[PDB]
């Protein structure tokens, strides 16, 4: 609740969070078979929290499960889909019983008239409805695992304008809340899939805000934004890519309190 | 194969 802020030490905190951030083994992402299932050579899932694809040949996709015990909120953070990936993306989404998708990074159907099919993973994707607001756009989507012939609906929230290492303060929250209100975050359903370009900077900022906002409800002013992020950064390396972004989560959360 | 980072 206190501005650092005249001190100007915002980077010093980031350097601490970056430095004191635990690093874990990444054996499986590293494998020559999995060289091209990664978009980014530097960003990779921790071997312990990674999502495993059910398809027997290769169970690897670049996603990591965040579980936050106390807050009760679980997210799945993944790089955006590559050409290869699109099938895997929806595979996981279907495997983890997810009922919400969060794109913050400027693989779905543009027209209702035209369905989408992935031979690779044997899933279909049809648009159902669309909603454009200026800040963010929402689609109502339908997934059928063709083999099952069982259809389960999915909600896609696209934060249209978040710069690659940029923010994000009101629109962010409206958007966060919109996602909350839809019930995609609710624990009845599997994890909400959150994806930035590699699923760290924007993803972290997004998930950071929402979790801490949950803490104030549950707990009062006890919460520390660090400690939570360090803890969060245990499941997926490199969450929050800038000091400006960190400051922003701190900020959003403060504003979100009211 | 690019790096997101910096």
Question: At A16, which helix (H) or strand (E)?
Answer: helix A11-19
Which tokens is A184 given? 């995609």
Cα A135 to Cα A2: distance, rounded to the nearest angstrom: 29
The single-letter DSSP state of residue A37 is G
CATH no. for residue A246?
3.90.190.10
Q: Which of B1, B4, B5, B6 to mutate to test the interface with A (most CBs of A within 10 A)?
A: B4
**Shortest Cα distance from B1 to chain A (angstroms)?**
5
From the centroid of its chain, how far is CA A248?
17
Identify the domain containing residue A241 by its residue range: 1-258
Cα B6 to Cα A252: distance, rounded to the nearest angstrom: 24
Place of tokens 């975050």: A185
Q: How many CB pairs under 8 A join A and B?
A: 18
Helices (H), A31-170: 86-95
CB contact under 8 A, A241 and B5: yes
Resolution (A): 3.3
Strand-pair partners of A67: A74
- Give the sheet arrangement for strand A50-52, strand by strand: A50-52, A60-68, A73-78, A192-195, A101-103, A150-158, A137-145, A123-132, A116-118
Considering its fold, how many domains does chain A have in total? 1
CB contact under 8 A, A42 and B4: yes
- A41 neighbourhood in chain B, CB within 8 Å: 1-3
């Amino acid at each position: 609740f206190e501005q650092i802020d005249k001190s100007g030490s915002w980077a010093a905190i980031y350097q601490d969070i970056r430095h004191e951030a635990s690093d874990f083994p990444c054996r499986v992402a590293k494998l020559p078979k999995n060289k091209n299932r990664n978009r980014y050579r530097d960003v990779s899932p921790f071997d312990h929290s990674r999502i495993k694809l059910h398809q027997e040949d290769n169970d690897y996709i670049n996603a990591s499960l965040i579980k936050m015990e106390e807050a009760q909120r679980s997210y799945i953070l993944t790089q955006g889909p590559l050409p290869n990936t699109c099938g895997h993306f929806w595979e996981m989404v279907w495997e983890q019983k997810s009922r919400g998708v969060v794109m913050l990074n400027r693989y779905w159907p543009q027209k209702e008239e035209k369905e989408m099919i992935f031979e690779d993973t044997n899933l279909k994707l049809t648009l159902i409805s669309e909603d454009i607001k200026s800040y963010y756009t929402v689609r109502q989507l339908e997934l059928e695992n063709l083999t099952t012939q069982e259809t389960r609906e999915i909600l896609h929230f696209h934060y249209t304008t978040w710069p690659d290492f940029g923010v994000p303060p009101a629109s962010f929250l409206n958007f966060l809340f919109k996602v909350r209100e839809s019930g995609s975050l609710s624990p009845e359903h599997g994890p909400v899939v959150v994806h930035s370009s590699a699923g760290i900077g924007r993803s972290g900022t997004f998930c950071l805000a929402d979790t801490c906002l949950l803490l104030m409800d549950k707990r009062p002013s006890s919460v520390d934004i660090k400690k939570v992020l360090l803890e969060m950064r245990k499941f997926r390396m490199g969450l929050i890519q800038t000091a400006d972004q960190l400051r922003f989560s701190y900020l959003a959360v403060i504003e979100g309190a009211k | 194969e690019a790096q997101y980072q910096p």
